[PDB]
Amino acid sequence: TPIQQLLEHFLRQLQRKDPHGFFAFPVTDAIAPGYSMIIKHPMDFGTMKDKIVANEYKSVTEFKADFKLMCDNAMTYNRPDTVYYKLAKKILHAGFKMMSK
């Protein structure tokens, strides 16, 4: 509870870097064939917002680990020439820069 307000601010800033909403909600296999076979631990902004409010993050370090999970997942499933991989890599770097001390 001393980080909940901080985490809410971090997640609104990071979601503003994905205006199309590519990482807004869980990926399904009907729209991304094989996802569930390739990605073992799915993550997305909706899920992270849920976990904030549910107090499931005990540190900023655990929140940053879920953001890196979401971007790493995207960089594995999508090829480097795709819009998805390019956005994931971009916001990964930008968002860790913002979260750092």
UniProtKB/Swiss-Prot annotation:
Q: Where is this region: Histone H4K5ac H4K8ac and histone H4K5bu H4K8bu binding?
A: 76-78
Q: What is known of its domains?
A: The Bromo domain mediates interaction with histones that have acetylated lysine residues at specific positions. Also recognizes and binds histones that are butyrylated.
Looking at the record's lineage, which domain of life comes first? Eukaryota
* Record site: Histone H4K5ac H4K8ac and histone H4K5bu H4K8bu binding: I31, Y84
* Its biological purpose: Plays a role in chromatin remodeling and regulation of transcription. Acts as a chromatin reader that recognizes and binds acylated histones: binds histones that are acetylated and/or butyrylated. Component of SWI/SNF chromatin remodeling subcomplex GBAF that carries out key enzymatic activities, changing chromatin structure by altering DNA-histone contacts within a nucleosome in an ATP-dependent manner. Also orchestrates the RAD51-RAD54 complex formation and thereby plays a role in homologous recombination (HR).
Q: Where in the cell is it found?
A: Nucleus
Residue spans making up a coiled coil are none
- Segment of the intact protein contained: 139 to 239 of 597
Instruction: Give the protein name, as stated in the record.
Output: Bromodomain-containing protein 9
This protein's assembly is summarised as:
Binds acetylated histones H3 and H4. Binds butyrylated histone H4. Component of the multiprotein chromatin-remodeling subcomplex SWI/SNF called GBAF, which includes at least BICRA or BICRAL (mutually exclusive), BRD9, SS18, the core BAF subunits, SMARCA2/BRM, SMARCA4/BRG1/BAF190A, ACTL6A/BAF53, SMARCC1/BAF155, and SMARCD1/BAF60A. Interacts (via N-terminal bromodomain) with acetylated RAD54. Interacts (via C-terminus) with RAD51.
| Organism classification | Eukaryota, Metazoa, Chordata, Craniata, Vertebrata
Bromo domain boundaries: 1-101
